[PDB]
Amino acid sequence: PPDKLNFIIILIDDYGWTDSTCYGSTFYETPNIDRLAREGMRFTNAYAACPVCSPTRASILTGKYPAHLHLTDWIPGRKQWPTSKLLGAPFYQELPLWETTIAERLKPLGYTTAAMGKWHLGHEPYYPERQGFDINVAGTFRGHPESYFGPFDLPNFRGWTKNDYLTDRLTDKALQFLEENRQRPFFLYLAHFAVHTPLQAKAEMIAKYERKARGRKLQKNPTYAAMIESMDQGVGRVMSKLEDLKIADHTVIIFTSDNGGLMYEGSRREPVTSNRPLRAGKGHLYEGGVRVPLIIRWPGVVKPGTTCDVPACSVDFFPTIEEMAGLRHDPKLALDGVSLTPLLRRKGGFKPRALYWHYPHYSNQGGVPGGAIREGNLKLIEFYEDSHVELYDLSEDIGERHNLAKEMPDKAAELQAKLKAWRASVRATMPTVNPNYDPARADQGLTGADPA
Ligand SMILES: [Ca+2]
Ligand SMILES: [Ca+2]
């Protein structure tokens, strides 16, 4: 007969567009992720459907936009500033069980399914076992690890010692799943806790990067760089286990991020990484917070070493996988993604389209309520506090410094209206004018509030 495809999604947490060597970094050292890029297709215009953790994770699994899911902030969300211009919108504190995940869709084709690492889509019963997965390892309502060192006390991930590194032990448990299901068709959602705060790593590895951090100016944080090395080791271990088991040939790998790099977590004087050239990072609707790494190895279909400039989003993985597994798109599902198989096959037929964002919240990283649309090369951001819009040309201004909104006031009007129409198509919940808005004491004093 043929060879049913396996699927691994490797999802690094808060991993920036430029936090890998094959994406421009000179600090961070990511040799395995590089080998994956050389073995596959690297996407220059890949996006996360939301600039914070929970909703992007909900996007990936459902093929639906966060605004459409009504899960639009990280759970449970920034505390309300008592005096801001806006009251945050309410949202589901869980990925609802009535949403279909890619795991549920594969199950009936004989797939074994596991979610391992960061869940952050609600308390149990909204955990993975009740959402298409056979195995949960380390998933909870939590959006971060208490520590990167043992002992541990998480679901099916219980106990090591103060000398055991999380990223290392999580990887062993994922290898365990590969070893167990070596002969079966499987889907693995591998969501590292890396590289979310708190910054902790092996001392010897930190030392390496302090020696390199001298007069670096930009990407400067040794602990973080070490987190990335320990993460990159975990990725090689997966890649090379697939070799030892003689199934790399028919296993699809998708390597990406749930949002852009952290840089100025709420009133902290130091940034964690930098996304230059891109403006800002995690918690913002600027490209820093939404443009992410995306590498796809599909041995024998994706010509290795290729790249793709076409904009892709978290919503596209559901239908991509569905089609990779020989499934008819269910017309009752009403997803927001399209399949990337035409791009991966370097064939044509990939219809040109718009991407949408909707973040009716204040973020912990300086972000403010807004939405955005990207059509071809132009990108409009709408700021919900005062309805003002910014428009950038990302072919000429990837760093979003020159605002064209005054210069091209009709493309601005066109895109704002296209975005408003989408907001309606999905009944995006909007924020509200705060009755206790007091401009005097409305500054929340988060160091991320752009200037760039
Ligand atoms: Ca995240
Ligand atoms: Ca379900």
Residue numbers in the entry: 6 to 457
Per the authors:
Carrageenans are sulfated polysaccharides found in the cell wall of certain red algae and consist of a backbone of galactose (G) residues linked together by alternating α-1,3 and β-1,4 glycosidic bonds. Sulfatases, which remove sulfate esters, modify the functional properties of carrageenan as well as its susceptibility to various GH enzyme types. They are classified into 4 families based on sequence homology, structure and mechanism (SulfAtlas), where the S1 formyl-glycine dependent sulfatase family include most of known sulfatases. In our study, we characterized a κ-carrageenan sulfatase, AMOR_S1_16A, belonging to the sulfatase S1_16 subfamily, which selectively desulfates the nonreducing end galactoses of κ-carrageenan oligomers in an exomode.
Here, we describe the identification, production and functional – and structural characterization of a thermostable carrageenan sulfatase identified from a metagenomic data set collected from the Arctic Mid-Ocean Ridges (AMOR). Named AMOR_S1_16A, this enzyme exhibits an exoacting mechanism, removing the sulfate ester at position 4 of the nonreducing end of κ-carrageenan oligomers. AMOR_S1_16A represents the first identified and structurally solved κ-carrageenan sulfatase from the S1_16 subfamily. With only a limited number of available structures, it introduces an important novel functionality to the diverse and complex enzyme repertoire for carrageenan processing, while enhancing our understanding of the substrate specificity and characteristics of the S1_16 subfamily. S1 sulfatases are calcium-dependent and contain an essential calcium binding site (typically D-D-D-Q/N) conserved across all S1 sulfatases with known 3D structure. They require post-translational modification of a cysteine or serine to formyl-glycine, which is catalyzed by the formyl-glycine generating enzyme. Additionally, S1 sulfatases share a set of polar residues in the catalytic site crucial for sulfate hydrolysis.
